[PDB]
Amino acid sequence: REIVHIQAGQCGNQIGAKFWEVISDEHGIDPTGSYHGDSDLQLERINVYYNEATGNKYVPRAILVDLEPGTMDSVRSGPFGQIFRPDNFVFGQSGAGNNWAKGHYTEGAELVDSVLDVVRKESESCDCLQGFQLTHSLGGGTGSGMGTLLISKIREEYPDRIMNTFSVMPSPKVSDTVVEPYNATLSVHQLVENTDETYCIDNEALYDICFRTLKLTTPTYGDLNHLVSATMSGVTTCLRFPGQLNADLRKLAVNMVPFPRLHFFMPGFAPLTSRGSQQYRALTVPELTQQMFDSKNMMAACDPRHGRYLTVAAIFRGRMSMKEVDEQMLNVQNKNSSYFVEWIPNNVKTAVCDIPPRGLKMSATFIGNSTAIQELFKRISEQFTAMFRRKAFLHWYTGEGMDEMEFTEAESNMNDLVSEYQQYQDA
Amino acid sequence: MEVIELNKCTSGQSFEVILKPPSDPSLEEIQKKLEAAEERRKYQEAELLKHLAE
Amino acid sequence: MYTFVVRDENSSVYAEVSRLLLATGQWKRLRKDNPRFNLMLGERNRLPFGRLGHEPGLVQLVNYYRGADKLCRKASLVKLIKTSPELSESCTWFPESYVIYPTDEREVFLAAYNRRREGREGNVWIALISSEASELLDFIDEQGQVHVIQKYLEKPLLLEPGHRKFDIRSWVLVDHLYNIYLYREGVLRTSSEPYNSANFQDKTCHLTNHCIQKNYGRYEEGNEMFFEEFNQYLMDALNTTLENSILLQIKHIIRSCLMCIEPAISTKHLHYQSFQLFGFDFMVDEELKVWLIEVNGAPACAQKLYAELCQGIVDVAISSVFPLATSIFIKLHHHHHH
Amino acid sequence: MRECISIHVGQAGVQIGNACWELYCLEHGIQPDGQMPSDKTIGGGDDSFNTFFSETGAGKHVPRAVFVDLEPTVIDEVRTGTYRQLFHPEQLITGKEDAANNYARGHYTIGKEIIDLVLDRIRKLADQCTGLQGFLVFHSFGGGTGSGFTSLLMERLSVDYGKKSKLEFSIYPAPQVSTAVVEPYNSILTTHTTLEHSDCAFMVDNEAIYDICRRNLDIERPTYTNLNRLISQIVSSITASLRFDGALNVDLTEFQTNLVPYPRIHFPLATYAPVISAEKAYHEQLSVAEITNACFEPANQMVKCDPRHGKYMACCLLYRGDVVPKDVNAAIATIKTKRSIQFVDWCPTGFKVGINYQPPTVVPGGDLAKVQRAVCMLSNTTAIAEAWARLDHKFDLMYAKRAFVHWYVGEGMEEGEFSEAREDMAALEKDYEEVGV
Ligand SMILES: Nc1nc2c(ncn2[C@@H]2O[C@H](COP(=O)(O)OP(=O)(O)OP(=O)(O)O)[C@@H](O)[C@H]2O)c(=O)[nH]1
Ligand SMILES: Nc1ncnc2c1ncn2[C@@H]1O[C@H](COP(=O)(O)OP(=O)(O)CP(=O)(O)O)[C@@H](O)[C@H]1O
Ligand SMILES: Nc1nc2c(ncn2[C@@H]2O[C@H](COP(=O)(O)OP(=O)(O)O)[C@@H](O)[C@H]2O)c(=O)[nH]1
Ligand SMILES: c1ccc(Oc2cccc(CNc3cc4c(cn3)[nH]c3ccccc34)c2)cc1
Ligand SMILES: [Ca+2]
Ligand SMILES: [Mg+2]
Ligand SMILES: [Mg+2]
């Protein structure tokens, strides 16, 4: 059961490099790709993300994509920069200029076939490929435009393979350019159709968390990425370690996605912690449960009380009473049953892994498929219309061959997605 | 009350006690259903590759 | 914070119970199809008992005893009595009755009605109240479904002033431990027109239902005499009490009825628990001998007693299972050694 | 002597199969390497244990079993398990991709790619039989393989072996031990498709096994290992009459005769006692009367329900250990006057009793304590329909919104099969009620 990882653009590669930095530590792989741990549990399901080569040196099944070499050169000189297969560094020179059209139609189209050659090369080595995973932002050009172009072309060559993504949503609080709503709207259209799981990461939520909880007056992208990497590691725990849960990506997706278009998840994590700030007090199970269900710990700026949970998945890590876990989980549902749909029995499932992450003696990762996610898309839609009603900044796109009608369609499909979530919120 | 059909052996014994008296599809049809469902997949997969072709 | 649901809206009794629960600020009402409940105030027909006690981490309770309809149905009650040895056909406190199916023990009814007619004995029966068999057997076949024929108590106790008929209604509560709680405040649903021994067809003086008789409000407010008065009347008119002359017989009939079916409905070792409010209807003859008329599975209460009873239910039946952060009941128990 | 072939489908089926054959070996004194010192007929024979085991000239006793999963990891643990030498590689069959808890995928999609292979590997066993009775099929309702591929196999077995009987050991889904949400769909779908192909099916609700392990074995959070070793004991009690000398339920045909008067209503309720913890320092051994009386306590049933509010059609009492007919009849007499036991009018109110003097064997280092006498009651009561009511209600809630349906349709299944199956289940609930009230 192998997974092929891809990371596109500036944001995608930086959280992606961070992901491989974190889980490489959990699996005891050093920057040079050599194993150095104590237990053997951290090698039973390591075939999922790593490739064995030249005398038990482990190489990530990762493909690093970008339309400019700036970010990928930083990755290569970074902490775990050496671990990555050098051939898997596929990059252009022109950049995308935070333009979805450049990444999806022109500049990216010129490079996409080169990436697929690496994807194809990795896939054919897998005994049984179970799916792909992508890390990118939706507010830029490459990770947004080319990222979705890759997904569309991956689905064409692998129409029966699971595609999950970790998608960073743009927000005016943490913004690079004003055309982010445009790029995001165009990308969501692509994600609604061609992915099985999308973990919606709002930079607004990551910002508010870093400021209002972690007590960081001015958070950087580095701070924001500590939160993401912790979540990325968490949701893949039970796939990376031997445990109770015998499930591939497909099976996992079947039990979380009641409707094909509604697969946009709210990720959460507890306890919330900043870089460097050392936690001494291990949380009790009641505290882990209460925190992972609190809005303040969600990483999409959406209030779960403004919607209902279609499905919920939780992963507790560390040494704890699995009985106490079941009791506390069953306590949340029975105390707030109005926030869970009644027409999907037992829609809250839990799993436990004995291995905790680095720095914490026990932690919990929250995956919620709430209808409250519509607030996220409604925000993008508002910011989108405000410019589009005046056709502002549109020349950047029409200069790359796009027509106004394609924007009108993308706008309609997301408003459809919003209305879809609203249908099941009132059932 | 009434014990009957008492049978005994080295391994054990069995009996009956009464307290009160009273008062397929063919191999053809299967392979047809399976292959009819396969064509429904092929049609769905085709509409996808068609949609992606556009 | 416990949770509950309501699946019977016509229940005047548990409409008051749902009220009281919400007023404690420790109970929360859910939707009628929400399974994650602690308490269920179920319906009267096809209550899904099979779906109770299958929710992990939820102690579930219901306000009905599954199988308690055998006692609360006239056709079943007669069967239950003359089939169960604990009560037997030789029952002293239950009128002689037979089950008759429209075109069964019809042949058994005839012979029993032989010397009751051709033997100078008194003779009146009830389903319509008549003194001739064919007058009854023709009526049951004319309506539709099964009825019960029963001996009519021709010599009822009569209240003066008025020379009136009456029937006693007792409210009994069975908790999850099958403790049998008799409510101390019962009621006499009395007649206002004088009982007529001759003509039976005018049923305003024979049938003592609160519905039929609405001389209403003459002697009593609502044709409802409570125990404090009925006790005083007995003391003045017959030199006896309510406890002695009637209540001992009532407390006996109640226990005998519920202890009979206990092994068939008890939720002692079940995965879901049950409690239920019953309404026993009794009848006293001139010799102060109490007769059981029927048992009501879904009883309505008296206006005065709604507040007190509906509070009592919460205390012993609900809060006993779900505790929150002198008694109005009489516990019926008796262990005679022999 | 007539042989029986066991078919273990899916994760639940395989791991339970492991637990059963592990227990069978200990009961017959067969070693992990397949050697049975007590068997003096080397190379073959037609004893009662040969019903479940064939023999090689080398003296190895191999199970007449086939393990099938659409996914290697579970069965791989058999290939490398302590009983690895016991089985033949041909008996173990694996795919590469599981059915992902998708009935349609295990039945139509992936099932089609392997159905011919399994039937062949089964035919290899049937060719070694002198007089095949039929098959015992172990699986789960909730699994895609256990539900999807099982129903497909059960259809084909009725074609290739039309005469032979077929019994089921089915795991009814419980939220406490499952991470799945679509199990109600899979359960209804496989029941509808297998119903006319199953002569007798023994259901086991994981909920009941789970609470029994918590209540009586004092295990706070039962693992599948805890659940299976208890389930294996129940299965052993039920199959003991096929593997040992006796005159009650000696062939698979007699199971249907004794327990199943009406074909569709072929789901007998199992109740087992006593279940005693091995860690229990002090234990007073229970009598015939006490263990027999425990067969009428819902807390000891494989499925939680209330037989008091239903009617019996058949009832078997299977004792193991120090028991004689005299004590049983006395126990039955006492219980009859205390409990509510109503039979249908067209059946005699009675009990078929089977006793095996050998007390129940316990897995060394297991959770179960050795007892002097145990019993397993097999009663065909209409009260088991409560399990269908539960399952059909959960099915209705999800399907009214067509939740998860696209996963099945995406595998070639039609939305109509959901309703056909649900209506068949609705007919079944009605059949139970016609008989029961
Ligand atoms: N009692 C018991 N139940 C099990 C066991 N393994 C799985 N189950 C139950 O089986 C159900 C899920 O079906 P599985 O058997 O795991 O799936 P499968 O048959 O392998 O089919 P796939 O979906 O293709 O994997 C859940 O309800 C589990 O509780 C087991 O070892 N013992
Ligand atoms: N054998 C009998 N002898 C005298 N009166 C009788 C009787 N059977 C019935 N009654 C009268 O019938 C009246 C009410 O009838 P009954 O209670 O049988 O029907 P019902 O169920 O509609 C009233 P409830 O709503 O309390 O159940 C009683 O008040 C009683 O006077
Ligand atoms: N969390 C996080 N978000 C980022 C980072 N870099 C850029 N973003 C966000 O992504 C958007 C810009 O996309 P970018 O990755 O620069 O586009 P690309 O490199 O051309 O694919 C903006 O909305 C930023 O807020 C990062 O390092 N971390
Ligand atoms: C970079 C890293 C990661 C990314 O996203 C993913 C990739 C692979 C796998 C997963 C995890 N998916 C998942 C897990 C569970 C689930 C449904 N889905 N239901 C559960 C119930 C209990 C326990 C776990 C789960 C996410 C993208 C990019
Ligand atoms: Ca031999
Ligand atoms: Mg940038
Ligand atoms: Mg499996």
Side-chain angles (χ1 to χ4, degrees):
Chain A
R1 279 183 215 163
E2 298 77 3
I3 294 172
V4 173
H5 170 97
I6 305 168
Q7 53 189 60
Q10 184 173 38
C11 176
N13 276 273
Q14 268 161 353
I15 65 179
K18 196 76 205 324
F19 168 77
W20 288 108
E21 175 177 338
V22 168
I23 69 164
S24 295
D25 180 90
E26 291 191 9
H27 286 282
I29 320 298
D30 70 354
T32 80
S34 276
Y35 175 63
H36 276 121
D38 44 15
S39 171
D40 286 328
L41 278 81
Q42 62 190 149
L43 276 178
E44 191 164 326
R45 295 158 89 123
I46 197 167
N47 62 305
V48 181
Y49 280 110
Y50 287 85
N51 245 310
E52 209 165 340
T54 81
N56 284 252
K57 240 161 284 164
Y58 302 92
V59 193
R61 196 169 302 94
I63 302 169
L64 298 83
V65 184
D66 202 341
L67 281 168
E68 64 184 0
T71 306
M72 284 173 60
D73 285 329
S74 306
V75 173
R76 184 143 46 197
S77 64
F80 286 72
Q82 146 174 352
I83 204 176
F84 295 109
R85 182 171 170 79
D87 281 23
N88 294 15
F89 286 79
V90 188
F91 54 91
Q93 295 286 347
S94 60
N98 299 119
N99 194 329
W100 192 85
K102 288 191 174 183
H104 201 79
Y105 287 131
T106 59
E107 303 292 348
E110 190 177 346
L111 187 67
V112 67
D113 286 345
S114 310
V115 179
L116 293 171
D117 291 333
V118 183
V119 175
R120 190 176 304 100
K121 189 179 182 178
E122 288 289 357
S123 292
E124 293 177 336
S125 300
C126 296
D127 181 83
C128 188
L129 176 77
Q130 55 172 331
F132 304 83
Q133 71 182 30
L134 177 70
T135 57
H136 66 144
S137 66
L138 306 186
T142 308
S144 187
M146 190 180 177
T148 53
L149 181 69
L150 277 164
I151 290 169
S152 186
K153 281 189 160 59
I154 285 170
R155 188 180 184 193
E156 194 177 25
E157 188 174 347
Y158 314 84
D160 68 329
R161 291 288 97 92
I162 300 295
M163 173 65 71
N164 300 345
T165 70
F166 252 69
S167 306
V168 179
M169 309 292 184
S171 178
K173 297 297 185 180
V174 199
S175 189
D176 291 340
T177 65
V178 298
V179 298
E180 283 171 3
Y182 284 157
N183 300 336
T185 302
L186 293 161
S187 283
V188 167
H189 192 161
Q190 302 294 315
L191 293 176
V192 163
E193 259 165 68
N194 295 330
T195 70
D196 287 279
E197 297 181 12
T198 289
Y199 293 80
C200 304
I201 297 174
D202 196 324
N203 267 8
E204 201 184 352
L206 295 187
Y207 173 82
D208 292 332
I209 285 172
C210 276
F211 183 75
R212 303 194 212 172
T213 300
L214 276 33
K215 301 312 182 194
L216 306 173
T217 55
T218 51
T220 64
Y221 280 136
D223 294 322
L224 265 54
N225 287 340
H226 168 65
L227 298 176
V228 177
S229 65
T231 301
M232 291 176 70
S233 176
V235 301
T236 59
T237 290
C238 297
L239 281 151
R240 284 188 294 105
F241 287 117
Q244 39 146 122
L245 186 83
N246 190 316
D248 55 13
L249 294 180
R250 181 176 282 103
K251 186 181 289 190
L252 289 173
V254 165
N255 293 314
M256 279 296 290
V257 186
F259 309 104
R261 287 163 55 89
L262 311 184
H263 58 276
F264 292 96
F265 301 162
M266 285 170 51
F269 188 90
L272 295 173
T273 63
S274 58
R275 279 189 297 158
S277 67
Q278 216 172 21
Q279 161 169 330
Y280 306 137
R281 179 177 64 187
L283 281 69
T284 67
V285 176
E287 288 174 332
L288 275 179
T289 304
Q290 174 273 326
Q291 285 180 18
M292 82 189 301
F293 268 101
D294 188 29
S295 62
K296 301 180 192 298
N297 295 41
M298 313 278 166
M299 301 191 170
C302 304
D303 195 37
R305 288 186 183 269
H306 295 167
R308 305 183 82 194
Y309 289 114
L310 297 171
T311 54
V312 182
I315 302 172
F316 295 76
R317 302 188 65 179
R319 234 66 185 79
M320 71 193 75
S321 175
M322 257 165 284
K323 168 173 124 82
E324 198 177 5
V325 171
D326 292 332
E327 287 175 354
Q328 287 299 318
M329 289 301 300
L330 290 170
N331 171 84
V332 169
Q333 303 175 230
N334 297 330
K335 182 59 181 296
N336 311 273
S337 59
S338 64
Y339 293 113
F340 302 79
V341 295
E342 72 279 14
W343 42 270
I344 302 178
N346 319 124
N347 57 358
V348 185
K349 297 303 190 186
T350 320
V352 179
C353 177
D354 301 327
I355 310 301
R358 169 141 288 175
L360 301 168
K361 270 189 62 163
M362 48 170 55
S363 58
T365 311
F366 175 83
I367 308 172
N369 188 5
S370 175
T371 57
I373 194 70
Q374 68 172 304
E375 292 184 351
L376 188 150
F377 298 118
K378 276 197 287 183
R379 278 196 302 271
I380 303 299
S381 189
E382 285 176 10
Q383 301 163 10
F384 177 97
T385 300
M387 295 184 294
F388 190 70
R389 63 183 171 178
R390 304 294 287 268
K391 312 290 165 139
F393 306 97
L394 219 64
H395 71 96
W396 293 124
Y397 300 85
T398 60
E400 300 292 313
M402 291 185 67
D403 192 86
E404 293 186 1
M405 262 292 124
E406 182 166 353
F407 277 72
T408 310
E409 291 168 10
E411 181 181 20
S412 298
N413 188 45
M414 190 160 68
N415 285 327
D416 282 342
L417 181 76
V418 165
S419 88
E420 249 192 283
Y421 278 114
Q422 188 56 58
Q423 155 175 28
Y424 297 109
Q425 182 175 313
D426 302 327
Chain B
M1 297 183 68
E2 187 176 0
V3 178
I4 59 170
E5 263 288 341
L6 173 64
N7 188 233
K8 307 175 73 191
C9 67
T10 312
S11 295
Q13 50 183 308
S14 51
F15 62 96
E16 177 174 1
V17 52
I18 306 174
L19 300 177
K20 179 172 65 62
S23 306
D24 291 20
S26 60
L27 178 59
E28 148 175 339
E29 301 169 45
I30 291 172
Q31 271 165 344
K32 138 174 170 184
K33 106 179 169 164
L34 295 185
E35 294 166 10
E38 182 179 19
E39 265 296 322
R40 278 196 292 271
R41 287 197 305 276
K42 283 173 153 54
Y43 178 75
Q44 288 166 3
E45 176 168 356
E47 290 295 292
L48 173 60
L49 296 178
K50 183 204 179 184
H51 180 267
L52 289 177
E54 294 181 357
Chain C
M1 186 61 61
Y2 309 108
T3 57
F4 75 93
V5 295
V6 185
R7 298 165 64 89
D8 186 23
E9 292 289 356
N10 295 335
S11 171
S12 48
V13 178
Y14 291 104
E16 173 62 23
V17 177
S18 61
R19 173 200 132 187
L20 292 170
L21 288 166
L22 297 169
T24 58
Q26 305 186 52
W27 279 89
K28 177 184 174 183
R29 180 173 174 178
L30 314 178
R31 307 274 295 190
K32 89 178 167 72
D33 273 36
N34 193 327
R36 313 200 74 87
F37 59 81
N38 285 113
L39 174 63
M40 165 170 162
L41 308 180
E43 56 272 35
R44 285 180 55 174
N45 301 126
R46 308 214 87 79
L47 192 162
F49 290 98
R51 307 212 304 265
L52 301 175
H54 297 282
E55 289 296 337
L58 277 180
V59 184
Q60 296 197 330
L61 179 70
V62 64
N63 67 337
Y64 274 98
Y65 265 98
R66 190 186 183 187
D69 57 90
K70 284 186 187 310
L71 192 74
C72 295
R73 297 301 189 278
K74 298 184 172 57
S76 303
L77 178 59
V78 174
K79 188 188 175 188
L80 176 63
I81 284 173
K82 70 176 178 176
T83 54
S84 299
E86 297 96 293
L87 320 176
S88 85
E89 73 295 340
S90 60
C91 198
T92 76
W93 43 258
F94 192 67
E96 188 182 342
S97 308
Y98 302 86
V99 181
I100 308 296
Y101 288 92
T103 43
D104 195 329
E105 306 298 340
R106 177 177 295 186
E107 290 80 350
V108 188
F109 166 49
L110 303 179
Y113 175 45
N114 184 258
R115 289 181 181 177
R116 180 135 283 102
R117 193 194 166 258
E118 265 193 319
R120 294 194 296 272
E121 288 183 355
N123 174 19
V124 188
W125 293 66
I126 186 170
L128 183 144
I129 316 169
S130 177
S131 181
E132 221 69 13
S134 58
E135 249 295 326
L136 300 164
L137 291 174
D138 284 331
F139 172 81
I140 47 163
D141 305 342
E142 275 171 344
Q143 184 141 86
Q145 293 72 17
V146 68
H147 280 205
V148 175
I149 181 67
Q150 177 173 60
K151 203 186 309 191
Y152 192 86
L153 305 178
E154 305 172 25
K155 315 204 78 179
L157 186 75
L158 300 173
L159 291 170
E160 310 295 350
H163 205 63
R164 313 141 68 186
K165 194 175 180 181
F166 73 97
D167 73 272
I168 302 175
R169 160 56 69 82
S170 296
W171 290 280
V172 180
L173 175 61
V174 188
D175 61 1
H176 61 286
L177 303 172
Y178 215 89
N179 294 327
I180 299 171
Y181 293 108
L182 172 60
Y183 187 22
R184 67 188 182 182
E185 301 287 348
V187 62
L188 273 71
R189 301 176 301 187
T190 67
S191 167
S192 54
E193 294 76 359
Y195 176 82
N196 186 267
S197 181
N199 268 315
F200 299 102
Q201 290 185 337
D202 290 340
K203 296 183 181 65
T204 321
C205 65
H206 290 53
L207 278 60
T208 58
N209 303 342
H210 187 285
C211 296
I212 293 172
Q213 298 189 349
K214 292 191 67 163
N215 302 83
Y216 166 81
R218 181 163 165 76
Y219 317 85
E220 315 156 20
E221 182 182 351
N223 293 24
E224 286 180 1
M225 186 193 301
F226 295 143
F227 282 2
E228 189 177 36
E229 177 175 4
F230 183 55
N231 184 78
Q232 184 65 234
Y233 165 73
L234 287 174
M235 285 191 298
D236 300 333
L238 288 167
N239 197 28
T240 184
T241 64
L242 173 57
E243 173 66 38
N244 302 22
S245 64
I246 294 174
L247 206 68
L248 282 181
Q249 293 179 81
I250 282 177
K251 290 187 287 181
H252 170 66
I253 294 164
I254 294 165
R255 207 198 320 132
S256 302
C257 283
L258 297 172
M259 291 300 296
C260 174
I261 61 171
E262 182 178 14
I265 66 172
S266 176
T267 65
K268 183 175 180 179
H269 300 304
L270 261 185
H271 46 280
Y272 76 88
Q273 242 62 13
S274 295
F275 72 86
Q276 185 171 352
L277 183 75
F278 297 88
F280 288 76
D281 295 332
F282 300 102
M283 188 66 199
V284 195
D285 57 8
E286 62 183 16
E287 288 171 336
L288 296 169
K289 202 279 192 66
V290 184
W291 300 82
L292 177 60
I293 301 299
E294 63 154 17
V295 188
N296 293 94
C301 181
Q303 295 297 334
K304 181 197 173 203
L305 310 173
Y306 263 92
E308 194 174 29
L309 179 61
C310 293
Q311 174 57 27
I313 295 173
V314 177
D315 278 278
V316 299
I318 295 177
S319 293
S320 57
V321 183
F322 308 112
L324 307 184
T326 182
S327 180
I328 61 168
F329 295 106
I330 307 173
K331 189 170 182 176
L332 305 187
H333 51 246
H334 197 93
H335 289 76
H336 180 246
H337 294 239
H338 58 268
Chain D
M1 186 280 290
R2 303 196 70 195
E3 303 85 348
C4 291
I5 301 173
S6 296
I7 305 172
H8 311 289
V9 188
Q11 177 173 115
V14 166
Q15 298 187 137
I16 288 170
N18 277 113
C20 288
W21 288 104
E22 177 190 21
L23 185 57
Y24 291 170
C25 284
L26 293 176
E27 287 179 358
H28 295 289
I30 304 174
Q31 288 178 314
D33 62 339
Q35 291 297 315
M36 185 177 169
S38 62
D39 181 25
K40 303 305 183 187
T41 39
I42 306 297
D46 60 339
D47 299 331
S48 281
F49 66 82
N50 291 121
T51 298
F52 276 53
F53 298 86
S54 48
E55 303 179 34
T56 68
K60 175 181 275 185
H61 295 59
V62 305
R64 303 181 187 274
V66 50
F67 295 68
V68 52
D69 199 345
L70 305 179
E71 186 267 321
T73 59
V74 181
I75 288 174
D76 282 342
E77 273 177 323
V78 182
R79 296 185 172 117
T80 67
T82 61
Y83 286 92
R84 56 182 175 273
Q85 308 173 41
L86 205 68
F87 301 98
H88 214 218
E90 291 79 344
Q91 299 177 266
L92 322 176
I93 321 172
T94 64
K96 45 141 158 51
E97 242 180 23
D98 64 55
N101 304 147
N102 195 348
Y103 170 91
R105 180 174 174 88
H107 184 84
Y108 297 98
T109 307
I110 300 179
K112 186 175 180 296
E113 293 182 355
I114 201 167
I115 181 60
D116 291 325
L117 175 60
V118 175
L119 287 172
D120 185 88
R121 296 291 180 79
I122 288 171
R123 177 62 64 181
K124 304 248 133 150
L125 290 174
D127 291 342
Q128 300 173 23
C129 290
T130 66
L132 179 67
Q133 308 184 40
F135 311 90
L136 304 187
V137 185
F138 303 76
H139 68 101
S140 62
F141 278 175
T145 303
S147 73
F149 182 69
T150 298
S151 63
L152 175 59
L153 180 64
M154 290 287 279
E155 277 187 337
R156 287 286 284 271
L157 289 182
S158 294
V159 173
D160 296 22
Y161 307 83
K163 134 74 169 164
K164 284 68 177 64
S165 292
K166 293 194 284 298
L167 271 65
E168 279 189 296
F169 289 94
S170 309
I171 305 302
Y172 177 107
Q176 236 147 358
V177 281
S178 177
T179 309
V181 65
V182 296
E183 291 184 284
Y185 284 162
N186 299 339
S187 308
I188 273 67
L189 287 168
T190 187
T191 301
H192 160 60
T193 309
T194 310
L195 205 58
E196 292 179 352
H197 306 273
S198 185
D199 305 286
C200 179
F202 301 105
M203 278 200 301
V204 178
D205 195 339
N206 274 348
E207 181 190 66
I209 305 296
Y210 189 81
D211 283 334
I212 288 166
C213 282
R214 287 169 55 188
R215 193 187 320 108
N216 297 334
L217 299 184
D218 296 320
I219 302 175
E220 252 177 3
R221 172 78 228 240
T223 61
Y224 285 140
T225 307
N226 300 127
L227 300 184
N228 292 336
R229 279 215 262 258
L230 177 54
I231 289 166
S232 64
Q233 281 292 337
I234 279 73
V235 175
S236 182
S237 300
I238 296 166
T239 61
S241 51
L242 298 165
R243 299 175 293 109
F244 290 108
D245 186 16
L248 178 61
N249 302 338
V250 296
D251 54 45
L252 300 179
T253 307
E254 198 176 339
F255 278 94
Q256 166 261 313
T257 294
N258 295 344
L259 296 167
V260 187
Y262 276 68
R264 278 173 63 82
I265 303 175
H266 56 261
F267 298 89
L269 177 67
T271 318
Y272 191 86
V275 178
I276 308 300
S277 177
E279 295 312 290
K280 198 196 199 182
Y282 176 85
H283 176 55
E284 300 172 354
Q285 294 295 332
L286 298 168
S287 67
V288 172
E290 288 175 314
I291 64 172
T292 305
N293 190 39
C295 289
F296 298 88
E297 288 294 342
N300 298 323
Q301 296 168 0
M302 297 303 96
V303 185
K304 291 188 179 186
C305 56
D306 201 338
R308 301 177 301 176
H309 299 99
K311 280 182 169 54
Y312 292 84
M313 281 159 285
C315 204
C316 294
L317 288 169
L318 304 172
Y319 297 87
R320 298 183 89 167
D322 179 43
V323 179
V324 292
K326 171 175 55 153
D327 302 326
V328 178
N329 295 326
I332 289 171
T334 302
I335 294 165
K336 179 60 180 180
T337 67
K338 280 186 174 181
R339 294 191 184 271
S340 303
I341 304 174
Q342 281 263 59
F343 271 71
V344 295
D345 294 328
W346 53 274
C347 285
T349 301
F351 301 83
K352 285 191 172 64
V353 184
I355 300 169
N356 190 287
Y357 294 156
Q358 188 178 303
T361 306
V362 291
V363 182
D367 303 284
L368 290 181
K370 185 66 159 187
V371 295
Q372 285 177 327
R373 61 190 65 80
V375 61
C376 180
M377 187 177 74
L378 297 181
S379 58
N380 194 338
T381 171
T382 62
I384 200 167
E386 295 177 25
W388 297 131
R390 291 163 53 201
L391 213 57
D392 290 337
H393 179 72
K394 290 184 171 174
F395 180 101
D396 288 340
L397 284 176
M398 282 190 293
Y399 190 78
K401 305 293 185 295
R402 300 293 193 279
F404 302 96
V405 173
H406 72 277
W407 285 107
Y408 299 73
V409 176
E411 296 291 355
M413 211 173 108
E414 276 179 352
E415 185 165 316
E417 184 173 356
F418 271 90
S419 57
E420 287 183 24
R422 179 58 181 92
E423 281 180 345
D424 188 19
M425 290 301 301
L428 188 65
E429 279 203 55
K430 241 190 67 170
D431 296 333
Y432 269 100
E433 180 148 21
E434 286 185 39
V435 181
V437 311

